[PDB]
Amino acid sequence: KTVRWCAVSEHEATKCQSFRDHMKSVIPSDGPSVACVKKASYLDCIRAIAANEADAVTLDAGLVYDAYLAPNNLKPVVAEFYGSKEDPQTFYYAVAVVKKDSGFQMNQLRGKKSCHTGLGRSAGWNIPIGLLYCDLPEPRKPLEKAVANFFSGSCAPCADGTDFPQLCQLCPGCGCSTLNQYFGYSGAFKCLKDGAGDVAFVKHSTIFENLANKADRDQYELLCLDNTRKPVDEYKDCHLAQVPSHTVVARSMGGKEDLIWELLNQAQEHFGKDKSKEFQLFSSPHGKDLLFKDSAHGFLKVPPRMDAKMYLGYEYVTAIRNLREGTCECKPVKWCALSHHERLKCDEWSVNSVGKIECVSAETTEDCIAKIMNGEADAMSLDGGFVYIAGKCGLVPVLAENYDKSDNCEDTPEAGPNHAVVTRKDKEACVHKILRQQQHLFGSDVTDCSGNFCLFRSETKDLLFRDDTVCLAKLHDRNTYEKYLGEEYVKAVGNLRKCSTSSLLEACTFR
Amino acid sequence: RLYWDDLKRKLSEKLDSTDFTSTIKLLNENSYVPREAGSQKDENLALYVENQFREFKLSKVWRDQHFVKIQVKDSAQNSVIIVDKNGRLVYLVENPGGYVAYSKAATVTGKLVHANFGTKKDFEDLYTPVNGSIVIVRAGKITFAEKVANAESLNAIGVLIYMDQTKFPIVNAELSFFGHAHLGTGDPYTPGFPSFNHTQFPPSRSSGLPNIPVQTISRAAAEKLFGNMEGDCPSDWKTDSTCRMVTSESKNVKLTVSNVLKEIKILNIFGVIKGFVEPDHYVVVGAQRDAWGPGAAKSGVGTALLLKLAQMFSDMVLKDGFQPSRSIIFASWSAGDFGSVGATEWLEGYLSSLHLKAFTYINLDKAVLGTSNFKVSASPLLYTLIEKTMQNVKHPVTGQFLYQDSNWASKVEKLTLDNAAFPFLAYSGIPAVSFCFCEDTDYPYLGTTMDTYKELIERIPELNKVARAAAEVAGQFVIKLTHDVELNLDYERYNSQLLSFVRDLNQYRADIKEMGLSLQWLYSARGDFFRATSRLTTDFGNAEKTDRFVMKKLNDRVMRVEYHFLSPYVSPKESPFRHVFWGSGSHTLPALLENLKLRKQNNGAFNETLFRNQLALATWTIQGAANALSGDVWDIDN
Amino acid sequence: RLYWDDLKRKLSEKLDSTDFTSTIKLLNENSYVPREAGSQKDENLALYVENQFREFKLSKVWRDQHFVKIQVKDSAQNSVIIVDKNGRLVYLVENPGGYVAYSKAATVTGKLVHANFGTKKDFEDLYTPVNGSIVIVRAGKITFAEKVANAESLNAIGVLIYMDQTKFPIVNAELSFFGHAHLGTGDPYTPGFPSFNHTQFPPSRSSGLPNIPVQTISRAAAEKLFGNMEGDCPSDWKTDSTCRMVTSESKNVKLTVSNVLKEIKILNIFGVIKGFVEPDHYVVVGAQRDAWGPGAAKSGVGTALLLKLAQMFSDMVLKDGFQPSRSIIFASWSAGDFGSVGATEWLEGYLSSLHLKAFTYINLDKAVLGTSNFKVSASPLLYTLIEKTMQNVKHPVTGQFLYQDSNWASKVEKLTLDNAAFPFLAYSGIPAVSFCFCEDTDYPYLGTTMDTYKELIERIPELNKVARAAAEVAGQFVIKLTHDVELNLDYERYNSQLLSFVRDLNQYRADIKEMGLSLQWLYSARGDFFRATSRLTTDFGNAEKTDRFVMKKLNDRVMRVEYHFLSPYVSPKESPFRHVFWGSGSHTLPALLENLKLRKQNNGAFNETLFRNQLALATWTIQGAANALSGDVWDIDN
Ligand SMILES: *[C@@H]1O[C@H](CO)[C@@H](O)[C@H](O)[C@H]1NC(C)=O
Ligand SMILES: *[C@@H]1O[C@H](CO)[C@@H](O)[C@H](O)[C@H]1NC(C)=O
Ligand SMILES: [Ca+2]
């Protein structure tokens, strides 16, 4: 069946029809075909797939957020990797490139000319403006007005020129397409090379793509976080932040995800990098970064469980949300419930803690772990097998369920592995604080559980915590999935995960 | 085109060039000097407000006329005298100028007892039984009608209201004051329905009407009565040393009230500014116009702010270029001294038209009484809208912002019957807000003939700066609610409100366990309400703000929370204040706790059959509100 | 992609390949042969319907369990005997198998009078006073509960219900039948609120419960009683020649009923198909599952149609490619024989969730009883939706279309208490429709033990063709309401309804003029309602159909007309049937006319103070509905 691909401007349109022709000859009629849809911007492509006019289009990690938002509802299905085919990389470096001996650093960018890849882009907007956000003059909302006053002249593609003229001073109208002289990675570098801007925010591979001469490449410098300038070749040592790779998005329901990857897998094996001289998948004589990025070496399949918020991660999703809204004693701990009985005991615990601990229920045990990831949940109790799965996603355990009665239960931990309370990295301080006060009020008590509340007692058997637990012991060391379980247990559940694989474990291993 | 910061500065610049004191002084002219409801002077100012609204070039300006019944002191003056055990003797105390509206009007005689404020708690502590005797109470803490209601319940024959020197430091002791004893809002002769000629005015009367005569007397007249009484008043009450407890066995008081009813025409005049995106949704800004006396603090300020906010916002639309997403209605209410009649009759008549269309009411009455502190009584949802405005508006006297107390939400007082915002929140289910630059002690010359412009200037020197600050707070409420496509109604706030109710009910967990009742269902009802707001908060996070359709589907769910708290089990005619948090009735949540307080004392006052029903409906009211908030009709669990 | 004509043909093709008779026969198996409410056989078919819905791959399938109280004939059998003036004598008449649910259950004795049908009109024509005596009435014309209610009002001690040969040509004269005497709908022990464990089941009882014992007896048992009675029944009543008027002065009847209450679990199972444009708006299709006897005509047909319509519509979405703009919910109700309990408890529990979200209810119960004529009872708004369907669907026996009578709208009968669609229209305010391929005479074996599949096949030879025609009419209702972006709810139709009410009130214009009342305000209220629909009709004409936002603002105004006819003055707990056109109460429009009929007879039954209030609220109910329909809140005139 045919797959409608969305193309931006004339440049991507010409590469699309050429891609449709070259693929038609090598692949039979029974196989997949490629169709092309004309669109003015990337935003028009997202609205097209949602309206069933197109099927798939590649976007930047920072533009995936926009595609996730209702009523577009797009999920990343195929992600491209950079570097080499032997060693795939699902993340690229974002750096700031300036001219040699300019006399400006990372902390001093006010009243300076800037060149961005595009509004909403990872390396061109989300990161560069993100570090300088809480240093911007009031007000901070809207975001575009503060950048307009910070930089004397800027060129940020896909931006409203009528409301913010200063962001389209270097590039009139702010074109979202290749039709604009300064668009994307290669366009933002051309904004620096021509002498229009003082600083350009692009990728680490952008310099090598535009300049081939070794003498010409030493005419630039990279700004670091500690206000220092390091060599262009040294990008691993000096960079802003590591961002997720570009990915192709499709509809969550009925977005033929299995048909699109079946098309792109055959595209890289016939017209990929260093495969054919007639047509290249990651290179075009009409322009740079068309359809797919020139720095890409292949494609990789994105697990079904992994959604757009999971693809970017908590660290990046929160950064975008705070960048648009305007945000620079502990908050209630949202506990995750599995069954009807667990949330019934949770609701009674919520009232007794006086709003210190809330309750959010999920369908299965695996679904609760995903909620702690994006921020819907905060903490929950899990057995040793699930601690390995939660730990591989990025959740560290803080408390251990002790079944032995001792003098100092909270001071000394138990080895047994036992059930552990896992939580998000940023809530480590709060969870270990609030729950410790709850044990002093509802922990070990007399047979008065008929009148008063008892945390370690359930209506049936093992609800929020196990019934044979004395107290939840705090870990002295910062234990991870490997530190808590031990070197012997990790290898045990790892080999068992090979035959019995869950959807969440495969999704967290992707990154 | 224009953002929040552009709007903040454009409003502030208009406020600096606006003269408030000149407007309040113009309303206190000899032409509008006395503004009794349905009087010539009331209509005169009404025509003035109509023309002024028409001069500001608003979208539409219309008037609504009602024919309501009020009570007035006619030919026969009311008198209070002391008599002997056999007949008329003693001496004539006073013939008051002032009176209490909607009084029984009957001649009564008997022993006199000081009930102090007249609070249900005050009566319970009285060592002297109030049964079959006239009670005298100080003005304050509560409503007159509340004062009378508490007395009538203990079988009192009548009620006398006076102002002590301690609470009311007034020089003149011969000064009389006005009030009303109707326990409710609106016209008491047209409950549930509007006072239009369409209803033909059928024979119907409100249950809130008192069955005993009520009269207000001066400080001097009270001291004359104390002279004939014996027994020193307890140090618990902050009152004068003249205060006496009961009359002697030889002499007792005789009160006679003879007020008659009068049919009058009330004019309610409105002004609207149509929105560009959703004109059908609107925020209402109301202000009282009528006053028994001169009314400078009661209605003088409020009406001045109403006219000026309607001016400033109209100039921002036409001249500046401000485009409100939702409409704004300015309302000049009449007959407010009689229990917010004009406003309640409008809500009772166009109830269907503003169902889920009106999302907020801002009240401008009594916004300026002092200068010490800033007090606001509103719905939980507007809590966050206020908090944000408090840390943005500076105090008129000092330099600091209004946001100084972090735990200000817990010190917020509930809306009372005398407030014009009460009918909007408890009857209609529209979140309302009433703010004040109040003082520690209430305004002394409030319901008196000394509510003049001169007295307002003397007490508040920098009146112009405080009125500008008042209009700035009210002005930012309008902006915030009509500027952004996202509603500023915080549904999240309420969870603290439900948690508070269940914690108070958790204290009596032993008494509930004794009966064949469990509390686990109320824990889930509360929990499900959190999960509903949490799901809605994430649903706002995963949606595009620029899209009109997705947002409207989400904002309509927010506009239903206040409605879903109105009890759907009680008749709106008999129990108009349906709201379960801030209403009056056995249906309300506080009443459920109050009824269970009688259980712990083991007396014959606790009704078990009533409590089992009270708990049943309230559990489902909170649950139903939770189920309707998120997950549609199939995504719900239980 | 697909239009109306494409949908009409795709539905018809699926109907031709669908075998109905095989499904009805499968439901009449020994496994589901007896389906009493809350029984094992009822749950068995419930689990079957749940699994079947899950097999059709619908969007979501969920169940709701209620714990309601019903009445059953237990250990002590009820008996009817004739006794002498001093004590027990005569002979034992019959011990009935059948009983009447929600009966008082008490032993009573006294004189017997034939009230015929038991209509309030029947009692008024009786030459024999019914006060203090047991009455016997034929089944028909009205509800049992209505029959009992009319008798209890005239102080009758008890009620006997039988089936004559004339109205019910049944061979077996020993046959017994079932029914219920509760004047209302839903669980009578949980009025206003749902029967969930959340409510803790408090001590509360419905006013609709009878205070006198009721029993059903067979034709043979009645003839035995007539043998002891004297006086020939008047030719006015179409009844048997055995019919006798009153018992002799020597002997009288003694009825004893001893039924007990039983708590049972009811399961309501639903199936939904999510819409693509507006999933939150949905149309509900319901059908009764339980039956006292075998139930072939009562619930056999209805449940068979429910399952097949859910199959056909699911296949059109998944396979054909049909995209509904609004959701469709299929509902299998239980405890319907006891007064549509399952359906009313669902409406009482999720009232807030379906407020202005559910816009139509389609009832499939008793859709097939005969073959002669097609009868439909529905709201005025669905009138045009039906008219269009009638001239599109052909009759199963003949070749002609169902649309033959042009003035069919005027011959439409109001929905009754026994119908499952009544609670939806009168309590919730959701337009409901109930259609039938009925006969001149009602189905004889309806509430009996002879409601078998065999008897249905013998009476209706071509059952498969009539069930297909029934599903076709119901199927086109769903399509039309979910296919187009414009709602097919005709608000225009109602004007005829209001005109009819004012013309009937205009006949008594002299009596109104005599009192201090005018009718001019009701003329305007009616007129303003026309102008409101006329303005809305033009507003649809001047708007683009493809635009989502403009249409949604207009369709929401259409969804509010039925709601605005529910009285906002009466308590939904005491008077659940708030609807002023088709409800029960002093609040309804018919009751206003019925009360004024007593005025012309000059007797002491007309209440002037009640009539002045009745007229006041109703005038404003029609006016308020008019004002809220068009012109927003400022474009209104008066
Ligand atoms: C309304 O009724 C009042 C009497 O209560 C009368 O004076 C007035 O003229 C009437 N107005 C209309 C429009 O009927
Ligand atoms: C509900 O109450 C009934 C008794 O009326 C009991 O049998 C049943 O187990 C209860 N179910 C729940 C969930 O409480
Ligand atoms: Ca009224």
Ligand SMILES: [Ca+2]
């Ligand atoms: Ca119920």
Ligand SMILES: [Fe+3]
């Ligand atoms: Fe990128």
